[PDB]
Amino acid sequence: TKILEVEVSLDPAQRHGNSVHFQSLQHILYNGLCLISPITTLRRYYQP
Amino acid sequence: SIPFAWLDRDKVQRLTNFLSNLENLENVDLREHPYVTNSCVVREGEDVDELKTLYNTFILWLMYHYVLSKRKPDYNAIWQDITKLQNVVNEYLKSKGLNKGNFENMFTNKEKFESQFSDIHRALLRLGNSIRWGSNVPIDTPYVNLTAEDSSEIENNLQDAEKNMLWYTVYNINDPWDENGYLVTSINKLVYLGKLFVTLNQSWSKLEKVAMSQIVTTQNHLSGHLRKNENFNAVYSQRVLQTPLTGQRVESFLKIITSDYEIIKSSLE
Amino acid sequence: SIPFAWLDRDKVQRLTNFLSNLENLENVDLREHPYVTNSCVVREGEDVDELKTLYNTFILWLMYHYVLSKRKPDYNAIWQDITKLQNVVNEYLKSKGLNKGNFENMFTNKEKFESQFSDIHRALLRLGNSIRWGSNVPIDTPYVNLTAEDSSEIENNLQDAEKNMLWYTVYNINDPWDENGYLVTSINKLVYLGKLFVTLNQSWSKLEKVAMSQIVTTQNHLSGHLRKNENFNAVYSQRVLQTPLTGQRVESFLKIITSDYEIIKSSLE
Amino acid sequence: SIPFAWLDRDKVQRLTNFLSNLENLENVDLREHPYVTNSCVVREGEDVDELKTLYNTFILWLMYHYVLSKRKPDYNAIWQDITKLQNVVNEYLKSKGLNKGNFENMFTNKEKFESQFSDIHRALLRLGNSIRWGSNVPIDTPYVNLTAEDSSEIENNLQDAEKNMLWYTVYNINDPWDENGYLVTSINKLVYLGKLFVTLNQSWSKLEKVAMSQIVTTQNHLSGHLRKNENFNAVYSQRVLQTPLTGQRVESFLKIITSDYEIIKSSLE
Amino acid sequence: KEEEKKKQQMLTGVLGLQPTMANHPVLGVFLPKYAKQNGGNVDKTAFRLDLIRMLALHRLN
């Protein structure tokens, strides 16, 4: 499982007013999974 | 025409085939083929080695420098494409739209005159611009322009051109699908062609310096070994084979030693 | 390298020469050159053609699409001149004077947008104004330009490009003797370059689509023939040659199928 | 080495002499020489002929089409003189003598309109009569250069071109009889060269269509005869000889049928 | 003879597999391909996972 950043800017209609250099930062959990309940057997192999 | 009748005709054919297919076989360097130097070796043991190997390797390095200066390809054909890409693409990049790199165009011309370290600096300053255009926000990453598979292939092509500057291939970087633009591919072309051009020129200067160092070393050893005799044939061989050489006098010297080959093979004791 | 099959060294050398001089010869189409396919067919009849020619024509179409993708020239260089001509001449004439064709300037702004097929539609309607300026009291004239032999040579060049997209030559229609005006010669330039660009992209996408369709068809027939066996080598050949192929995938798949040619020569009976 | 199915050396010499002197003999058409067709027959009567004369004629029509296609002369050298007359004489004559620049010569726009040339020539004959006698009504002579006996020689020359479009001649102009020198003799040369050009192109397309029609017919009959045998090399011959052909496939298919005449001589029963 | 030692060394490096498992078809076919690798810096774990997924592909009842 990898972290990936996303450097993306806005739509152009919000890019206009001195938001040309803005850079929204999006972290996306590539190849990971959601988790809902405390994992006990596989504590060695699963990182929250 | 073609000295050393006194060697084996098989070995003379070996040297003829080597000097005929030097531009065809890979790793063009006389150091990298020691069986040429070991096929150069003189019969009847070390007693005749101790004199004739120096003359034999002397004519080997002379012919090697000669066939290099005769078979050097033209590099102005690839510098023509470098100048074309640098002029057209950079001027339409900057003067046509969003002119910021006026000083950088100043730089590209002033460095295109005669500087190579500055061509490495331009490789930096154009990788910056290619990362600006290919993914449209400025950030820095080292040495990678695009396309990891072709990046692995370009190292193979540069090793091929560095080993054989006589027989080189231009890669034609461009991509049929359009995942990065025309201008990004043009910067890819210019970076690859600049590295190729400086690779060919520096490998050429390396081979020419090695060849002249070997020729001067063989002159010193051969004159020091022919110093002993006071025969007229010996002193005439000294006064012929003692003269200094340049890169543009080696052809006349090869003609002179070919014309006076009989008196120096008689002068060999 | 150059794995092909159980074919003769003669036939391997033939296919070597053909896929090397693909950009050299004209009318580049594997249907138009059937000698490649009967060089591809395997010795000793259909008892060993019935699987091996399926594999071998599969290898032909893979490496044919590979050498197309590796040797496509970049037609954006001619679309750059299309943008320069269409921008500088057309919009600025119709703005500087005769301020009625601004609807047609919105049309040529959408022509500047990458909708080439619909863009080159109504090149007649944007040629009629060039007819009006080349000859007074505007009539309808033939679509290719004013000089008769240049008009025929344009069509000859377009047929040459349509046969061989990989090797194309611009015509450079400009003349110092100018009975025809400067701006309408720029319009002639724009029409010729637009036709050249759309013709190259149509023929390229045509042959690319044909090659990919043939690759998928040979995969379907070859998997259907490999279906029956349940040995591990046979089902591994099924799972390798069953993998989906797109144009970005085909080059990595050619590397994969070399490293699996090491087995699937022996995996085939 | 021009491979033939089952022939005598006399018949091989006859067919090779026909394909060598195709451009030398008159009445260049394969249907006009029955002795070639009679020499194409195979020995041992109808039981051998019913299987093998189909393949023998299928050899001969392919080889005829290939040599005919290869030995096509350039038809642009005569159209260069047609444009030299049409551009320099008639346009400048109309601009000088105030004939308001009729574009009927430029209705061709290229050497593709083999239609309406007769109307162009009728307009040229009216212009020639009006130049020669100032106030003429249209009169019913085929050449308005005021010519009779060389008109008969011109009809003879056009018949000779119809017979041999591979090798052609251009006749002359003459001036013991001087009426209009640069003008109506150029009208004669333009009319004669137009009729010669359209005759060469129409007879060329006639022979090419006849040859390809006979090749497709022999494909159909020969594959219908060889459909029955289910043997290995027999259906290998079926898959070789089943391939469809056009005007440019035929060269490569001739190479195919040489390299498979290596086998399909024995493969035939 | 050196190639056989490379094959056997890679076999012991993968898992320490016994020759009884070396005779298995999935091994018999892939040990030669694992010979033309692992001379590089690649990994030891990659070969274990590769053998896992290939042995799995083999056994689809």
Structure, described:
This is part of a larger assembly, with one copy of chain A (48 residues), three copies of chain B (269 residues) and one copy of chain E (61 residues). Chain A is mostly beta strands and 48 residues long. Chain A contains one helix and two strands, in the order E-H-E. A two-stranded antiparallel sheet of chain A has the order 1-2. Chain B has 269 residues and is mainly alpha-helical. Chain B has eleven helices and no strands. The two termini of chain B are 23 Å apart. By secondary structure, chain E is mostly helical. The longest helix of chain E has 14 residues. The interface between C and D is medium-sized, with 19 and 24 residues. The PDB classes it as virus. The entry lists the keywords HHV-6B, human cytomegalovirus. Atomic structure of the Human Herpesvirus 6B Capsid and Capsid-Associated Tegument Complexes. Chain A: Major capsid protein. Organism of A: Human herpesvirus 6B (strain Z29).
Quick overview of this protein structure:
This is part of a larger assembly, with one copy of chain A (48 residues), three copies of chain B (269 residues) and one copy of chain E (61 residues). Chain A is mainly beta and 48 residues long.
